[PDB]
Ligand binder design. Structure first.
Ligand SMILES: Nc1c(O)cccc1C(=O)O
Ligand SMILES: Nc1c(O)cccc1C(=O)O
Ligand SMILES: [Fe+2]
Ligand SMILES: [Fe+2]
Ligand SMILES: [Fe+2]
Ligand SMILES: [Fe+2]
Lengths: 170, 170
């Protein structure tokens, strides 16, 4: 048993409640596994949309959150009310908002094989055009992602909309 | 959204409680998805060990169950007490026992690519040698599996231990 014995999940969540809040906000259950199993807390808001080449499974265990999405070309909102499960198809752009303190969502995805890339995108609040997109070989979420986001926030050139010139707030 | 909107999971489980019991016993949440998401009920006991080439994630939502396993070469038992989560590494032989009526376990695995095969095994209760093993390209669980099991139960030749001659009960 490379990942240990079964264990009580609510107890696990309580014991890590101090990570399920800012600044870290999320914690991965098992390490070096093909299934990436994460518990995400709150509060947290973000402006980035994730373009994940594989599926994402959500189970909102405690509290509520929601997913800003793009569907057919429209800004839509998928609610994760407490007790909801959701399976997100590949490449559906999504920006999870987790406003509630003390909330917990089980998120399961899997390791991306070599050459299968994740995208992170920002759209313009004014005209809705794509503002900036970074493709990344996601090997470690908590590690390849903060500095990527920091560079977008720190460059007005990246935040500048190619269509209307509005500078995204970051 | 190829798999629909979020939805309340406890409600879903209640509404399918009549499938989470014999003869069917389990129900898959979404169809034609890369993540195979299943809710397994009870009661059910079985003698087969599954050799799955990919990981299996368990979350025992209601009631209790357990997993007979082989580890290093020993018969071991992994308990799924209500509220336990568990991640099973690939190829660890496992035979889930689900004795409790009205129980529910979330089981998540993924579609096997072409040429990656599942194995199903039976061991001898007397000397512990391997008695019979079928490799299968698992494309649909509820479909390729009953007739496979029916053939093992129906053939004393398959149940006959190569080491000691005891005929497995099936
Ligand atoms: N967007 C997410 C991700 O890509 C991995 C784990 C969690 C989330 C999230 O819902 O916050
Ligand atoms: N062994 C299982 C499997 O291979 C798929 C879904 C459920 C189970 C189970 O735990 O009963
Ligand atoms: Fe994502
Ligand atoms: Fe714009
Ligand atoms: Fe299995
Ligand atoms: Fe035997």
């Amino acid at each position: 048993l490379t990942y240990g014995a079964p264990f009580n999940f609510p107890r696990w969540i309580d014991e890590h409640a101090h990570l399920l809040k800012p600044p870290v906000g999320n914690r991965q259950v098992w390490q070096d596994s093909d299934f990436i199993v994460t518990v995400v807390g709150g509060p947290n808001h973000r402006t980035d949309y994730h373009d994940d080449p594989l599926e994402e499974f959500f189970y909102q265990l405690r509290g509520n959150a929601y997913l800003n999405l793009w569907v057919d070309g429209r800004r839509e909102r998928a609610d994760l009310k407490e007790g909801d499960i959701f399976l997100l198809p590949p490449h559906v752009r999504h920006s999870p908002q987790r406003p509630e303190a003390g909330s917990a969502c089980l998120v399961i995805e899997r390791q991306r094989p070599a050459g299968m890339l994740d995208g992170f995108e920002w759209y313009c609040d004014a005209c809705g055009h794509l503002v900036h997109r970074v493709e990344v070989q996601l090997k470690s979420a908590v590690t390849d992602l903060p500095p990527l986001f920091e560079s977008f926030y720190a460059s007005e050139d990246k935040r500048r909309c190619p269509h209307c010139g509005q500078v995204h707030p970051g």
